[PDB]
Design an enzyme around this catalytic site. Structure first.
Site, short mmCIF file in Angstrom:
data_model
loop_
_atom_site.label_atom_id
_atom_site.label_comp_id
_atom_site.label_asym_id
_atom_site.label_seq_id
_atom_site.Cartn_x
_atom_site.Cartn_y
_atom_site.Cartn_z
N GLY A 132 0.83 -1.20 0.00
CA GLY A 132 0.00 0.00 0.00
C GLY A 132 0.86 1.24 0.00
N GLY A 167 3.28 1.23 3.29
CA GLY A 167 4.29 0.18 3.49
C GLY A 167 3.80 -1.19 3.11
N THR A 168 4.63 -2.20 3.30
CA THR A 168 4.23 -3.56 2.91
C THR A 168 3.78 -4.46 4.07
OG1 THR A 168 5.67 -5.51 2.38
CG2 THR A 168 6.44 -3.36 1.62
N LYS A 213 2.96 -5.14 9.30
CA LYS A 213 3.09 -3.96 8.45
C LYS A 213 4.36 -3.21 8.81
CE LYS A 213 1.07 -0.53 5.83
NZ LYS A 213 0.09 -0.80 4.76
N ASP A 224 -16.19 4.44 9.78
CA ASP A 224 -15.80 3.84 8.50
C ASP A 224 -16.20 2.35 8.37
OD1 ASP A 224 -14.82 3.91 5.91
OD2 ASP A 224 -12.69 3.90 6.44
N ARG A 226 -15.49 -3.81 3.35
CA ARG A 226 -14.03 -3.78 3.10
C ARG A 226 -13.25 -3.72 4.43
NH1 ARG A 226 -16.07 1.23 1.54
NH2 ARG A 226 -15.58 2.82 3.14
N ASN A 227 -13.93 -3.29 5.49
CA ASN A 227 -13.26 -3.07 6.79
C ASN A 227 -13.65 -4.12 7.81
OD1 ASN A 227 -11.74 -0.91 5.89
ND2 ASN A 227 -13.25 0.63 6.51
N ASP A 251 -9.91 -1.44 10.84
CA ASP A 251 -9.68 -0.09 10.30
C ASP A 251 -10.25 0.99 11.20
OD1 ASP A 251 -9.61 1.35 6.96
OD2 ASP A 251 -9.38 2.36 8.89
C1 LIG Z 1 -8.38 -6.78 2.61
C2 LIG Z 1 -7.48 -7.10 3.78
C3 LIG Z 1 -6.34 -7.90 3.24
O1 LIG Z 1 -6.46 -9.03 2.76
N1 LIG Z 1 -5.19 -7.18 3.33
C4 LIG Z 1 -3.97 -7.77 2.88
C5 LIG Z 1 -3.13 -7.99 4.11
N2 LIG Z 1 -3.59 -9.07 4.99
C6 LIG Z 1 -3.85 -10.34 4.56
C7 LIG Z 1 -4.23 -11.09 5.66
C8 LIG Z 1 -4.19 -10.21 6.78
N3 LIG Z 1 -4.48 -10.47 8.07
C9 LIG Z 1 -4.34 -9.41 8.85
N4 LIG Z 1 -3.97 -8.18 8.52
C10 LIG Z 1 -3.68 -7.90 7.23
N5 LIG Z 1 -3.26 -6.62 6.83
C11 LIG Z 1 -2.99 -5.56 7.72
C12 LIG Z 1 -3.61 -4.34 7.79
C13 LIG Z 1 -3.18 -3.40 8.73
C14 LIG Z 1 -2.13 -3.70 9.59
O2 LIG Z 1 -1.62 -2.86 10.58
C15 LIG Z 1 -1.99 -1.52 10.63
C16 LIG Z 1 -2.52 -1.03 11.80
C17 LIG Z 1 -2.87 0.29 11.89
C18 LIG Z 1 -2.69 1.12 10.80
C19 LIG Z 1 -2.16 0.63 9.63
C20 LIG Z 1 -1.94 1.51 8.44
F1 LIG Z 1 -0.64 1.91 8.35
F2 LIG Z 1 -2.69 2.66 8.51
F3 LIG Z 1 -2.23 0.92 7.24
C21 LIG Z 1 -1.80 -0.70 9.55
C22 LIG Z 1 -1.52 -4.93 9.52
CL1 LIG Z 1 -0.23 -5.32 10.60
C23 LIG Z 1 -1.95 -5.84 8.59
C24 LIG Z 1 -3.81 -8.95 6.35
C25 LIG Z 1 -8.11 -5.41 2.02
N6 LIG Z 1 -9.11 -5.14 0.99
C26 LIG Z 1 -8.38 -4.67 -0.18
C27 LIG Z 1 -9.98 -4.06 1.45
#
Ligand SMILES: *[C@H](CC(=O)NCCn1ccc2ncnc(Nc3ccc(Oc4cccc(C(F)(F)F)c4)c(Cl)c3)c21)CN(C)C
Length: 308
Positions: free
Chosen positions: A25, A28-29, A49, A141, A145-146, A159
């Site tokens: 995104g 970051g990854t 992340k 929100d 999607r969330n 989210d």
């Molecule tokens: C659908 C969600 C999806 O499949 N996203 C891909 C990443 N992913 C796959 C499995 C999975 N399990 C758990 N978490 C994630 N992704 C994820 C999102 C956010 C995150 O940590 C944060 C926490 C607070 C803020 C942020 C941010 F910086 F603002 F983004 C991130 C972590 Cl550690 C993991 C998973 C998406 N669909 C496209 C809507």
């Protein structure tokens, strides 16, 4: 307001291991990984992340404010933040939700999603939202999607990027301005930037509509700027083909212009639970009876069983 004694865990980078990339995104990854607290003989599936080096101070602050909110919630139907890691860029570690987002899940699996799953998801999301209401948190929100899918039987709200804790005497949050998810928002949020638990109920109704249409886009083709006057004229999202009038009436009630005339989350729990007890009376899905969905790895334990 009571003191917030939630614990924020700061993990060391050598305790978690990145296995593969799950997503990329702007910020970051995201990696699939394992969290292996030292000398505990347990391995926890996690998503990690790692923020980009180019992320601004402002972005960092906003992300940490989201982490604060996530660290402060603890409910089976709300996402689980395990901790953060203060390496040269911040890393965030959450419970792995291997089936991804619910919106994508229903689009991809629509020929195998039966009435029991749909109604149970509505119950679960209503429980999570009820919990947030008890915590005086307005999500702002809520949308398919969330919502994350741990297993097809268990979903969790995520989210918290827009979430606001109401002040003790405060009943409404008044927003400033920016890029807002218009098609999920209550009319009073669009017009006056007012958000309450009852405006979250509106978004819940739209979320339910997304599920019941197996992931259709709400008001498809209509520009976001036309939404408020469409709503003011009394028009709403149409009755999904699978929905009995019992289910559609509940969605319709969520979209009343009078916020106090909308159901409360605790009532939505009750109404959807009644329906979940006899699902084929409430949702008419061709082939419903037939349908089935999915139901070193030594020392692996889910985050939900790794308690603090
Ligand atoms: C659908 C969600 C999806 O499949 N996203 C891909 C990443 N992913 C796959 C499995 C999975 N399990 C758990 N978490 C994630 N992704 C994820 C999102 C956010 C995150 O940590 C944060 C926490 C607070 C803020 C942020 C941010 F910086 F603002 F983004 C991130 C972590 Cl550690 C993991 C998973 C998406 N669909 C496209 C809507």
């Amino acid at each position: 307001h009571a003191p917030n004694q939630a614990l924020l865990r700061i993990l060391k980078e050598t305790e978690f291991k990145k296995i593969k990339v799950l997503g990329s995104g702007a910020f970051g990854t995201v990696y699939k990984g394992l969290w292996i607290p030292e000398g505990e003989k347990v391995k926890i599936p996690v998503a990690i992340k790692e923020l980009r080096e180019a992320t601004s101070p402002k972005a960092n602050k906003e992300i940490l404010d989201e982490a604060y909110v996530m660290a402060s919630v603890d409910n089976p139907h709300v996402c689980r933040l395990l901790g953060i890691c203060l390496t040269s860029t911040v890393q965030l570690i959450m419970q792995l939700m291997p089936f991804g987002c619910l919106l994508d899940y229903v689009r991809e699996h629509k020929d195998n999603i039966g009435s029991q799953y749909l109604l149970n998801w509505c119950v679960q999301i209503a429980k999570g939202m009820n919990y947030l209401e008890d915590r005086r948190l307005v999500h702002r929100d809520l949308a398919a999607r969330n919502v994350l899918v741990k297993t097809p039987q268990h979903v969790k709200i995520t989210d918290f990027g827009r979430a606001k804790l109401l002040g003790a005497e405060e009943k409404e949050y008044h927003a400033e301005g920016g890029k807002v998810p218009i098609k999920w928002m209550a009319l009073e949020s669009i017009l006056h930037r007012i958000y309450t638990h009852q405006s979250d109920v509106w978004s819940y109704g739209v979320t339910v509509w997304e599920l019941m249409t197996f992931g259709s886009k709400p008001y498809d083709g209509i520009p976001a700027s036309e939404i408020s006057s469409i709503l003011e004229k009394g028009e709403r999202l149409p009755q999904p083909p699978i929905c009995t009038i019992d289910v559609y009436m509940i969605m319709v009630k969520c979209w009343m212009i009078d916020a106090d005339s909308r159901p409360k989350f605790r009532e939505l729990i009750i109404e959807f639970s009644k329906m979940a007890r006899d699902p084929q009376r409430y949702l008419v899905i061709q082939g419903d009876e037939r349908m089935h969905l999915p139901s070193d790895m030594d020392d692996v334990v889910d985050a939900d069983e790794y308690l603090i």
